[PDB]
C-alpha cells in the first residue's frame, strides 16, 4: 500500500548504479537528459505507491555519489519493501498436492525482502520447486527436474548470465529452459516479476 515489491527494489538499485556510470563519465552536461531520466524512473516506482521519495532523490542527485553512500541510502529504503509471504505448511502441501514426499525450504536461509519468488532444490530427486504470487495475489507453484551439472549462460527468468541448469517441467513431452541453479542469486537479479510469469506460461 505504502510499500514496493522486491523486484521494484532491484530495479531501483539497478537505476542507481546506472546513475553512477553516468557520473563516472566526467561530463554531466552531455548526460543531463539521461540523469533526469534515471531520477524520474526511480521516483515513479515510489509515486505509483504514494511514498515520499523526494528526499532520497535529492540525496542521490549528486555527481560525487559513490557505492558506499548509495548503499546506505538504499539500505534505508529496505524499510519500504513489501516482504515475500511464504505459504504455511498446509498451503505448500496443497500447492504440491500430488507430491507425497515434499522437501520444505529452510526458512533460516531466507531473507523475505530479497525474494520475488521462492525457489529451492531437493537434490535427492534432482528437483527444484518454485512458489510465487500470481496477478490475483494468490499462491501458485511449479516444480521440475534440474541437473546439478551447471553450465554458464543466460538465465531465462532474470535474463542475466549465471551458473544455470536446464529446468524441465512435466507439462513425456518436457518443456523448460535454462535458469539460475541458485534461485536466491536469481532473485537478486530479477527486476520484473513479469519475466517469471512469461517463463511459467511458456513451460506450463
Ligand atoms: Zn536467474
Short description:
It is classed as translation. This protein is an alpha+beta fold. The protein is 37% helix and 19% strand.
Topology:
Layout: H1 6-24, H2 32-47, H3 56-60, H4 67-77, H5 89-95, E1 118-122, E2 127-133, E3 139-146, E4 151-154, E5 161-169, E6 175-180, H6 183-189, H7 193-203
Helix pairs in contact: 1-2
Bound molecules: zinc ion.
PDB class: translation
Keywords: translation, antibiotic resistance, zinc finger
Assembly: monomeric
Please give the radius of gyration in angstroms.
19 Å
**Basic shape:** elongated
Beta-strand content: 15-25%
Relative helix content? 25-40%
Total of DSSP H or I helical runs spanning 4+ residues? 7
Distance between the termini: 31 Å
Question: What's the story with the biggest beta sheet?
Answer: 6 strands, antiparallel
Which hetero compounds are present in the coordinates? Answer: zinc ion
Number of domain modules: 2
Number of strands: 6
Category by helix and strand content = alpha+beta
PDB class: translation
Keywords: translation, antibiotic resistance, zinc finger
Assembly: monomeric
Entry title: Structure of the fusidic acid resistance protein FusC
